[PDB]
Amino acid sequence: DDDDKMLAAEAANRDHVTRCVAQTGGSPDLVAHTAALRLYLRVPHFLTEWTTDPDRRAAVSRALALDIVSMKLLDDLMDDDTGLDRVELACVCLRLHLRALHELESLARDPKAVTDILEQDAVHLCGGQIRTKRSRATNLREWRAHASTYGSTFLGRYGALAAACGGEGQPADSVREFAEAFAMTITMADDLTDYDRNGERDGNLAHLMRTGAVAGQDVVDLLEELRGRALAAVAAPPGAPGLVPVVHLYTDDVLVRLLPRHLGEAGAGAMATVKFKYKGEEKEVDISKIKKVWRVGKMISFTYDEGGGKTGRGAVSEKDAPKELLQMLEKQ
Amino acid sequence: VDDDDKMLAAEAANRDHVTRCVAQTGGSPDLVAHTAALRLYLRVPHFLTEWTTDPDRRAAVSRALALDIVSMKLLDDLMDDDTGLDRVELACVCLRLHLRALHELESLARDPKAVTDILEQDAVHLCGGQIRTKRSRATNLREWRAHASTYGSTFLGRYGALAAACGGEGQPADSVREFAEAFAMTITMADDLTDYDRNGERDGNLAHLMRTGAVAGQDVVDLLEELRGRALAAVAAPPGAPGLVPVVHLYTDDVLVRLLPRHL
Incomplete structure (x- = not known):
């Protein structure tokens, strides 16, 4: 029945974000754009899994959804490829983020925890994204280094925030370890879906694989390293056992469905x-x-x-x- | 050492605080320069902080504000997309400054929460406002002032409020804000009448409306006089910030003497 909680959180997050975007004046496209961010909207449920109080859990969950979406809109804005109105994106991006800060701060374990967390690694995050789009990756090592900032660091902040705003018994380091491991799994999945669905070549893992610059068996080991990292984090007391099927689900989806579209006749090697x-x-x-x-x-x-x-x-x-x-x- | 010396050094300090930050996070040389050419936005936090007596707190609140104003100005450039600068750098540096500003303002605030209370409070008015401004362009003084009251007045007023919340001891929070909102409309008009020739701006552009007859010079003169008064009044509520009296007159007279004839 956790699958049901998961779908209901996604819908709550979704609604809270589209209302917000609608009242700020964002067009109906832009509204349909953000309700379409299904995984982004769902991830907050995974991050708040350690949150014992349901009321606090739903509030923290949708606040995370507001900020995650806002950041995704800012990324759309830097690429100028959605077609969407540059203006509505900038304004809707700012408005959601400010609501997120206000909501997360009202639930925090400390008045400075939110901003401390956003600032702690802001430079690693931002200069990281700049270096990522500047210097495209050409081997697994490079690829993983880039993905560790716009993927792991990016989601780890939210991880740290859910622990900061989720009341008692949140094993901070673990929630954050889960978020970083899981984010890289999700980032690889995104990369190997978008070679085709989107048209991505430069620094993109699917290309590096079709090209030879990356060996399949190495992608499989990274994925296995990521799965174990996530499984262990979720195992730290008091534990978020509910996340185990979630970790296997995403890891297995990359292995079984996505990888073959890029290796072909033998994944292992x-x-x-x-x-x-x-x-x-x-x-x-x-x-x-x-x-x-x-x-x-x-x-x-x-x-x-x-x-x-x-x-x-x-x-x-x-x-x-x-x-x-x-x-x-x-x-x- | 007069008020001018205080202003110039405040401005140089805020500019350097901004460039160090833009540079340490990856900003390219063109972006760092762009950032330093934002003269008035780097200066304005000095005005907002005039009610702050402790000079160490005032310099700290001043640059924390500079980081965010510059940051918003970068997002503005990122939406118009006409500066020929790297959208990735603009968007990344933009976020970095903003996050650092929050962190600096919050560590200066009496109550850290007041920083996000203020930024959330009228976020919808500001943000929905900026969209409608670009959506539905102005055609008469009335519509122009309504739009400007958001991206100009509401925009700077939030910083007036942040400065009162971070300025600490005895600050007439409502007056600091009143001052920022009025002063903001005065400089937004200045900008509009300067940006017509420097940016190639027509629709909703106050200078364009003046040249086509949609807005009358005397009405513009009237608005400026109304804003001067509102600003002078705000800086005289107790305690008081007499230092801003010559400032309010400096920018208002510049619009009346140098800019309007360029249009009438």
Whole structure:
């Protein structure tokens, strides 16, 4: 029923943002633009998951949504590619942000916590975005460094804010650790969706992958590093167990749906192989060379291609049977 | 060391505080320069802080205000998009100054919350105002003054209020604000009558309306006289900021003597 809480928070956040944008004078486009920011509107629910009081939780949640959207509008404004009225964007951006400050400050654990947090790393954030758009990334290392400011740092501030405004029992460092790890997962997903949906090439991860400058298996490890970082943060006491399915959901979506659109025939890059002894020999074969395979007890018997018509043959214990060879069993 | 010496040094200090900040966060040399050419916006916080007696607090409140006024001015440039400067730098430096200003103003305020109370209070009037201004352009003195009362008067009045809240001990908060709102309309008109030739501005532009007959010189003269009085009055509520009397006269007379003939 958390899926229901999650959808209801999203709708509350959404409504609170479109009213706000409407009353400030933003056109109906701009209003439809911000209600469309579904993940941005939903993330505040993830960040406030440690918040025991429901009333405080909804108030902090929508205040975060106001600021996150506002920042997204400022980014639209720097790119001049939405078509939207430059003016309405600048004004609606400012108006939402001021409401956010006012709302977050009314719930804070300290009168200076909000501004301290926004200031602490403002330079790393802003000069970071400038360097990101200036010098496009050309390898995983560069890419990850850029994404650590406009992705992780950007969301980590909100993380820190939800802890600052969410009353008692908020493990500050953890909420913030979750936000930074999760934001990078979400940032990769965005990058690999937008190669196509949007038209992005410079410094974009999908391109760097289609180009060779980045190896698939390295993207998989980053994603796995990010998933573990998020899982551990959510595990710190008192814990936000509810976030576990959320972390797996987004991580698995990148792995299973997005990556293949850019690697193709083999995500890993470690073409599976079967090792065995045949006719006194040592042998190893590529799962791609394997024709027929069947099971005899705990043995896996099979046929493969040695070159030309030449039909290869072998049998191994399933205990040494690569997971890939076993998939052809059930699939046969 | 007269009031002029105090003003010039306040201005130089606010400008340097602004450029260090723009530079440390990534601003390019063109952006840093742009930022320093904002003469009056860098000066104006000196006027707003005249009621503050402690000179250390006054210089601190003065530059914290400069950071935000410059910041808003950068967002303004980012919406018009006609300065030929990098939109990414404008948008990033814009946010950085604003965030630093909040942080500096809040650490100076009696009650930190008053900073966001003030900025939220009439955010809708200011922001919806700036949109309508550009949406529906002015055609007679009445409409022009209504628009200007938002991007000019409401815009500076918020800073008057912030300065009273950060200025501390005994400040007639309503009068500081009254002063800023009136003084703001006077300089907005000045700008409008200067920006016509320097920026190629027609629709809703007060100087354009003057040249086409939609607005009469005497009416403009009337408004300026009304604003001078409102400002002079505001600076005389107790305690008082007599220092601003010559300032109010300096900018009002400049509009009457140098700018109007350029149009009538």
